[PDB]
Subunit: 429 residues, 4 copies
């Protein structure tokens, strides 16, 4: 297959206890023997065919036990010490000054651990808990507090400012016919056009960030939304903004129709930032999961009921209200507690009409919505814990993005290590 | 009783571990003895008085342990090999190439394992997990993908086309008094009457499918709905369609009153197809259970409250609204969040009227509905797993129906097996 | 203390396994020894000052271990056989034909087992599962099917007929001032007054049944409602009916105000019968437990919010709506999804008014009601099983009432046993 | 660090079983040894640097094992038993007449056990369960019944009377312009102004109680609300009352705006007293927890959606409704089941407007609210058991407040102990 044994050791694991201990054993034996035989050449550096070291492979596939072992390897023996992943400085009883190597964790130049674990395919079974392995959890916490937190809040703040400017520009849009509109020398219009230009500028910036994202990642349609959800939403916002520009200069009023959707998305995309706050990000996570997972089925069923009874009632009535659309709305309104239940007298067979509406109300307003709540009930009872960590996963994503951009034309964003050397990082735990 | 010991061995099981091992033991003993004593005569063909082999008995009664043994039984000894149910071709470490016999599994011509599991009496305790026994799950998956998936989607699509034609025909029904109506030479009317003819044709087809179903199955009233729910709904749709035809030619306007229910049912019956999709079928299954199991109790209680307080308020008022029906609606509207709570002034004892309505609102709008939700809460926490499998059963039903119909006057729809020879099926697992 | 050893042996138990085995051991030893010493006199007949045998004491206090022992105790030794509670006739493998004595289990003349269980004080910890002890479950099932089922359905049916007559009489009440009203010789008047007479007759009958109930039971206020809930409701219906009679002849229109509550109460009392049907009685039990347990806390809190903010808003407005009652209703309507949220313009400080209403809406409509749902969620997840046994308890109550009344001036409601003898009852299980 | 070994022994625990036994062992051994070596000097009196004895330290930090031991520590060795915490008077079989010392439990003059538990920093992991340790539970129950219960009901009653007077005064406020208002010699004015004076007096009293509370406690902002919630609410009510006074004499009508919030605050603060009633205080606890914990996240998300789509729709429409506020209300009304869903025709692109509203309704009305319920569902399933103790904890707070105030210039609120002596307290258990 073109891979070394150490990768196959990764492939054969399954995160069970017996399996974990056995794979630990094989790692131990092969690493010590290889050290004794080829002390010049290091094995764990050697990549598989896809350019991943065994560490990154365990990270990529969700093999938490192997990964935990490899990150937690101390070698303190003659002629083997150089292969250690951690050491201990201070051997106090309750607390240890542990010291970890960061090789191929942030700097790998092919695929680092945070890269492969963070940007895995979403099938990776353990990406939620896998960051709780001590050195990674510690690094993300350190990077968060140290420099990324402030930049993230700045990004959130500037997004808020962008949205305030966009909202202000949109709300005070000119009302004349036939865009584009002449800038009047009054300062109010100067601010308006400035706001519009900044609004579009934000649109273009998000557009290009989205393109860079999809070009780098090349996600597939079958999993375009399971991952990459936020980026799609920002990208789509920008798409609507740009369409609004095109219509705005194409002498179409319809640009408003585009802008407002962008504006609506422009605001709701703020929830992207609430992700990464454990206290307040759970709603954004759960809205993502519900829309992607759960809305499709409920809304197919609901639309079957709405449409079926809608066409029943519109068939029944004859003569206002005679359109399928109007009756679709009138029957929708039962869902929002404003259904009139005798909204037309222009029809025949009152008993039929009322029986239909009562059947509709019982079927949706009572039966369907409660089953939605029932399913969500069992599910959330099962998956609150998984959302509570996918918060952390998105925080890791935020940190990786933050390091990638950094906007100084330099690489002085290192984490730690001031003592002889492979970028040691110290945890007192 | 008229049975052999092989069936009684099935009857004695109860799917407990000690019981399972013991029944396996007795099977092993009699298999070896039967081989050595009557090598010319096959055991498992031997039917009980009802023409059921021991395999189909273990399947029919829900005896998952015995079935799981029998389908997964390899005999590799001298003078006993011929009694094996499966063999192993490739003894690779993680995966095996097992080869299974399909004798009386899909082709029996009396009753097969899939037939007796899928069309069990619905008391069968383990019909949900019973298909998880490897060879059955593999057969259904294979035949689903291989032939039945496309035909099912075609059936769903044609049902969608039928429903679109029916809906279009119904919506554009003529408004002239006194049906039936003369065809006008304009093409719109030609399409209309063509749509009507196709609509009725679909009605007749579903009518006759339902009759064939009930004639073949002969279900009882006490369990007519617990099983066979979908077929009843399709049949009832067709019944309404036919009644609409009769009225349509009986010079009655009331055909509309019938057609719409068929129309309302026709669209709603689309959820039938949504069964068999693991994701999207969760709701349709639940609406089957919730209506059959849970609507009766809630609606008796609810109608007791609605009707009792309805009689109270209609008694109280005197003079518009004086009818029991109108007050029944006005008090229903509290259930849909549109109760006015002072909907009449033509009455006496304002304090009594308001106390009645407040008692009604608290009793239903707050207490009864929330208690429904509480009950469903416990239940769904307990039965999400059972729906998650009954998905599989509906998929099996779809497959068995598909094999039964097949509409070519030929039997070349087999799954597999071409080499020495009882329809060998390979599972690489 | 004035009781024998066996009562203390009952008292010392606590339904733990070690305790259960020990107490059964002491029972065994003392019963055999007492038989050897005093073969003339039986210990287990010996009553406390309260006239309770050790069996009825174990039953009364909720002691499953002792009770299950005593009811299921076979003694087949020389000079000890005579004190057995059950014997085994047919020792078939899977089923036994057991034969049980019913002495002091239905006929005691002081306090039988079904009496002390069904009419326990509701503190009895295990009355729910206590009927699952084989011979009691079997007795209640047999008595249910044999004669009590039909009588109960007849009782339910006659209550339905009474309620229909009452409802019909009330709905068609005369509308003229100053009751009572002279009848016209027309048949409508005769049916109305006949309906009224039967209505009152049902009222009086329920009144006297309630008095008989409370006189026999002598409940206390602190637990008047925790038990005896249904009897209180029937009694109160009757009280309202009688008050309606008094006002009806006291030349006051206000009799209507009374009648309707008895009418509404009357109809809702039908839920009493739904208890005893496992399929449909769960809602009646749930509503009983919810109203007694859970309505008080929610409605105090809710009324605090409704009243507090209601006083705030009525204070704020000045000038229609200026009364505290009207604003109480207007703020109630938010609870039923019909709150207008700008229902008055006759006030000052729109910002204050709206902030108040929004705070009110968030606090009740979104926050309080969902909290009710959350509490009930945890509770029902814990107590569905206990409701599922309160069904059994009310079944026992129904049967005991049925046997008590019986309305023939004879006692020939016995079930089985004709041969040498203490009312032998046979169970195949 | 300036502490003796006993405080460290307290610190090192973690309430695990092995830890519990080990720490009990070391503490026990060293205490006996020290008693043998320095019989003149008492150790447990020895405070840490913060002035806490080891008992109060174990109490302060949430250490159940250590505290349970120390409260339940009996020493029966020569020359050591004088340092026991309990003795046993009567060694009856099921119950013991235990006798406990209360030194530094209610009287310490630095920090007593009830002080450090009740007024812990709210991080203390077991404060809710800690009072279930027998002698404390007994102390609080005894003090509750003996004198505190009546005083608590009295102060609750007086708070109710204050609120009734305040409400009456506010409701009948004068309606002239320009406060303050001259009193007419009629009695109605005198009762009104008397009510106002008492209203303000209650305001001032609560103001000063709140100041005394915060001065004594010195809470921090980061945990001002996690603890001390009720006191903050009472204090804020008083602040609003005082602001109302200032405006009332500052010749501003706006005093009404302040008073009503105090009024709405005041009535709502009545829920404070439901805490400490297990039957009815659960809702106050759950509302505290919801508002502090859960409202912030939901309302940020909800306001993002409401505001985002509000800006969308208000942008879209042009011409009544053109303001952002009005559209914010119109879209809020969907949340309360009164959304009109076609509330304006003064706009363009009906399709866009309706799609926006439908997206808004689905996103909030169906999607956001139901998942608030889902999240709470998991939470309450996990935390009803902890609120069920937070009740008792607040009862402890009530008792400590009661003992602190006592308003007689005497200390005659002791429990028992009159013979040789450290306030012996008897528990018969
Ligand atoms: C591509 C995704 C699936 C999406 C994009 C648009 C069309 C969207 O419709 C949806 C489908 C939809 C349509 C109508 C109602 C509900 C959902 O949901 C989101 C998407 C749905 C959202 C809600 O999703 C969120 O913003 C929450 C969120 C959670 C976590 C995140 O990381 C996040 O990043 C932006 C956003 C709001 C809309 O963008 C919106 O405001 C409009 C008018 C339509 C919603 O498609
Ligand atoms: C025989 C069954 C029990 C049924 C047949 C009719 C009368 C039906 O009323 C019910 C009872 C009912 C009446 C009024 C409101 C709710 C339920 O539910 C279904 C039946 C109820 C349905 C909803 O249940 C379904 O059809 C969904 C479904 C789920 C799974 C399936 O396999 C399926 O196969 C078609 C259908 C819709 C109605 O057919 C409909 O649209 C009208 C106007 C009445 C509904 O009876
Ligand atoms: C004595 C009980 C507690 C009760 C008696 C009356 C006043 C009652 O108000 C209650 C309190 C109440 C008032 C207003 C709204 C809800 C509850 O609930 C019942 C009682 C509440 C009921 C609902 O409870 C039931 O009847 C269901 C029930 C369940 C199990 C049963 O065994 C049962 O026996 C009849 C009845 C309906 C009312 O009788 C009714 O219809 C009117 C107008 C008031 C209701 O008091
Ligand atoms: C400081 C707290 C957090 C609080 C103080 C005021 C502003 C309050 O708004 C809140 C926030 C708020 C605002 C609007 C709607 C909901 C919540 O909730 C309470 C506070 C919220 C309450 C409801 O919370 C409670 O008081 C119940 C309660 C539970 C336990 C207690 O020990 C308790 O002691 C008083 C009170 C009602 C208000 O006081 C009220 O009536 C008005 C008009 C605003 C509510 O802030």
């Amino acid at each position: 297959v073109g891979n070394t044994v150490l990768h196959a050791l990764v492939e054969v694991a399954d995160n069970t206890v017996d399996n974990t201990k056995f794979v630990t054993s094989m790692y131990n034996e092969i690493l010590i023997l290889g050290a004794k035989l080829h002390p010049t050449l290091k094995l764990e550096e050697i990549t598989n065919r896809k350019g991943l070291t065994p560490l990154a492979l365990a990270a990529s596939s969700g093999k938490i036990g192997v990964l935990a072992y490899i990150l937690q390897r101390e070698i303190h023996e003659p002629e083997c010490r150089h292969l250690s992943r951690k050491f201990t400085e201070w051997a106090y009883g309750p607390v240890h000054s542990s010291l970890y190597d960061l090789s191929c964790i942030d700097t790998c130049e092919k695929n680092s651990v945070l890269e492969v674990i963070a940007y895995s395919s979403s099938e990776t079974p353990n990406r939620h808990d896998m960051l709780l392995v001590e050195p990674l959890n510690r690094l993300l916490q350190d990077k968060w507090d140290r420099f990324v937190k402030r930049i993230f809040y700045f990004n959130f703040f500037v997004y808020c400012l962008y949205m305030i400017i966009f909202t202000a520009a949109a709300y005070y849009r000119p009302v004349e016919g036939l865009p584009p509109y002449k800038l009047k020398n009054t300062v109010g219009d100067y601010f308006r056009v400035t706001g519009e230009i900044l609004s579009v500028s934000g649109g273009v910036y998000f557009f290009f960030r989205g393109i860079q994202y999809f070009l780098q990642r090349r996600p597939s349609l079958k999993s375009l939304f399971v991952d990459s959800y936020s980026e799609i939403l920002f990208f789509v916002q920008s798409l609507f903004m740009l369409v609004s520009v095109v219509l705005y200069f194409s002498q179409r009023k319809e640009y408003v129709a585009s802008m407002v959707f962008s504006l609506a998305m422009g605001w709701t995309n703020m929830l992207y930032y609430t992700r990464g706050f454990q206290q307040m990000g759970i709603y954004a996570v759960m809205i993502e999961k519900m829309i992607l997972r759960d809305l499709c089925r409920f809304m197919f069923v609901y639309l079957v009921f709405l449409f079926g009874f809608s066409t029943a009632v519109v068939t029944l009535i004859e003569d206002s209200y005679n359109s399928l659309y109007s009756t679709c709305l009138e029957l929708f309104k039962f869902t929002i507690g404003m259904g009139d239940l005798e909204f037309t007298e222009n029809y025949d067979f009152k008993a039929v009409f009322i029986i239909l509406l009562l059947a509709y109300v019982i079927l949706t307003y009572i039966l369907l919505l409660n089953m939605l709540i029932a399913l969500m009930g069992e599910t959330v009872n099962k998956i609150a814990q998984e959302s509570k960590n996918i918060w952390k996963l998105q925080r890791a994503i935020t940190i990786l993005d933050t390091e990638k951009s950094f906007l100084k034309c330099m690489r002085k964003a290192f984490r730690s290590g001031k003592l002889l050397y492979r970028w040691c990082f110290r945890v007192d735990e």
